[PDB]
């Protein structure tokens, strides 16, 4: 086509989706990670995670308002990944890298798994 | 903070949101523009438009499944802007620029209004 493209559009959209999440506007699901609860938008979770994409395209699970993750999932690791979904920024630290990588593998977020593998390899 | 950033994350999210729109997955509103109907995600519309942001934060309109636009709104102009919301690409042509700019003013999409004003000014 002969379209023009606004360079910052995708980033501006994601910024506003994070603002709606922070104000709890039109969030339609709560992700339960052991004792912790995280409110989010199903569409954003699906757009970021192979696991959520599979869950919310399922003809019964698409209608659930609560999703319980595997008890081995670390709440902080999930929190870091949810923040990444809504901002493109990943808070990867020596103290959390193992939990972040395991959570990213479970959530099927391949680019996160990739940077975790590389950061771990450099420390070996 | 000490976060790392994935450059293509925002674009990849928007691409997946457009794929969900194309397959009509978790769309929660229909925008009626005279004889034409457009299915979308309220969160994406709010993230792109000052008008939709105002509509869907309203305590009664937030729950509507159908929104009727002003009868002066051109369906093609709306279609072009909805495609832009979900892709960052604007199909701006001599034959549609007036309808696109008027629709962008109504929808409160200031960056679109700006490029339309500039493209019109260059032709004068």
């Amino acid at each position: 086509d002969s379209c023009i493209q606004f360079t910052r559009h995708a980033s501006d959209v994601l910024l506003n989706l994070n603002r709606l999440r922070s104000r709890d506007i039109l969030t339609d699901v709560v992700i339960v990670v052991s004792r912790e609860q995280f409110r989010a938008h199903k569409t954003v979770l699906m757009a970021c995670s192979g696991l959520f994409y599979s869950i919310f395209t399922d003809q019964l699970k698409c209608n659930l308002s609560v999703i319980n993750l595997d008890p081995e999932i670390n709440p902080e690791g999930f929190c870091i990944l949810l923040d990444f979904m809504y901002t493109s920024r990943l808070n990867l630290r020596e103290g959390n890298i193992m939990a972040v990588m395991a959570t990213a593998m479970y959530l099927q977020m391949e680019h996160v798994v990739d940077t975790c593998r590389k950061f771990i390899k450099a420390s070996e | 903070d000490s976060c790392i950033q994935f450059t293509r994350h925002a674009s990849d999210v928007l691409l997946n949101l457009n794929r969900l729109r194309s397959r009509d997955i978790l769309t929660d509103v229909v925008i009626v523009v005279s004889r034409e109907q457009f299915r979308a995600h309220k969160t994406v519309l709010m993230a792109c438009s000052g008008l939709f942001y105002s509509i869907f934060t309203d305590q009664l309109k937030c729950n509507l499944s159908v929104i009727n636009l002003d009868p002066e709104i051109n369906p093609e102009g709306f279609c072009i802007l909805l495609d832009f919301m979900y892709t960052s690409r604007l199909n701006l042509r001599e034959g549609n620029i007036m309808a696109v700019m008027a629709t962008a003013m109504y929808l409160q999409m200031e960056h679109v209004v700006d490029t339309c004003r500039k493209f019109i000014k260059a032709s004068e």
């Binding site: 379209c3 023009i4 493209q5 606004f6 360079t7 | 690409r89 604007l90 960056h111 490029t115």
Partner: peptide
């Protein structure tokens, strides 16, 4: 705005 750019030519993509």
């Amino acid at each position: 705005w750019v030519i993509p």
